[PDB]
Amino acid sequence: IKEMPQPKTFGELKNLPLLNTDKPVQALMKIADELGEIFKFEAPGRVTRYLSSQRLIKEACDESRFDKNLSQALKFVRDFAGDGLFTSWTHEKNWKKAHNILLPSFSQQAMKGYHAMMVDIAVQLVQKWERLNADEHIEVPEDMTRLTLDTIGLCGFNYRFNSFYRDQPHPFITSMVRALDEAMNKLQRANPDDPAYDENKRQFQEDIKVMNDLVDKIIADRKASGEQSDDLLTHMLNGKDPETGEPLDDENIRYQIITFLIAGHETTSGLLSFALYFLVKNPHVLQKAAEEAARVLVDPVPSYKQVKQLKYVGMVLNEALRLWPTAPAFSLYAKEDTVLGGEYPLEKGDELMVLIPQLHRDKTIWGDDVEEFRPERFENPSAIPQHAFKPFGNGQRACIGQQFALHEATLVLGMMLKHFDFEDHTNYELDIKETLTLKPEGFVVKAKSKKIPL
């Protein structure tokens, strides 16, 4: 039995105050750098063990021994995401039922049907940037977020948020973002039921209602029209779980739609933003990727197969996910009393948290140049050990949206590289904001048109 290190405690709240910050995952990364591959983290009546090495994480990823846990963060998100795929326990009825129903709508094959509407939004992004005046700049995460949110709105339920036409976010977005903020902020309140938090809770309900109203109404409208628009909502309304013969109920469909909108807004937009960041900081790599984009994307309207041919753009995206996996942590629990790593006994139910950024900096796997941006790491997928690279989570609880995210990102980054040269005009200093996910706050660039019509 080896004793685990533990960071400083701060009274009855034990370790909690270390995460009472705007950048808690970055704090945990620093603790991991200080204490090593495993450390214990205490809160009142809770002990969590944070894992950073491939040696220990590969064992945590054994689904016969460990299952997905709902961290307190996910439990608060569950207040509006309900028993949607992302905030359900594996054993809960609606997890397997929605998983079976939805899996085919997220396959690589399904991406052929989403491709046109992904291109519709991508073209809007390119046209926006073509239309800026010489003295103007691009706010990168802002525009990536407009793109990824609008794309899931169109593929999820055939709705146009029209984010490239508006001053203030569509009112659903404003409410979803404020709800996610409250959910994370709740984690840091020592006395939740203190009167100063009353306007928070009133605002929380107003927001949740703005969400359910767009969504319950969108579901009832579709049920009433019978319109067979070929999208995720159609598939959820018509699909039946082969294991049980039952379809999802309207309440669960609402939760799935809210969940996809959260993911659309929070995740892929972060990846695109980090990718563009690393490219402007590594101009030779940018030129290599732009050369591939010019060679491959020879139609003003890119096709599905052309996106599949963007091999080096895919490597750039994987290397951006290596350094800054945008959904950087996931939680597991021991299915039974067991011993981790031959050294750390666990009780049934004990929580393990995987720090993906730390996993992805394990020098025993990646070599000494781990901190550097080198897409060529990914030239041979066979060279990457099992469980060394995990930006989409693990096993049956991995990201159902992986193919969707990578198709969208590869298409968009390819079109960006086809149509513009990029200038890091401010010499931007990386500043990572944490919501549900990681994104580069304040990242701005200038884009000079290559004058290729589309």
Ligand code: HEM
């Ligand atoms: C680059 C973009 C994305 C990344 C890095 C990412 C990452 C992840 C990770 C790490 C998990 C596992 C979470 C856990 O174990 O607690 C996950 C789950 C999930 N993601 Fe994503 N995601 C991305 C994009 C998307 C998109 C675009 C969608 C859908 C529109 C999506 C929908 C989901 C859902 C429903 C789950 C839960 C799957 C299940 O447990 O059945 N994600 N994602």
Ligand SMILES: [Zn+2]
């Ligand atoms: Zn600005």
Ligand SMILES: [Zn+2]
């Ligand atoms: Zn937003």
Ligand SMILES: [Zn+2]
């Ligand atoms: Zn279909």
Ligand SMILES: [Zn+2]
């Ligand atoms: Zn026991």
Ligand SMILES: [Zn+2]
């Ligand atoms: Zn070096």
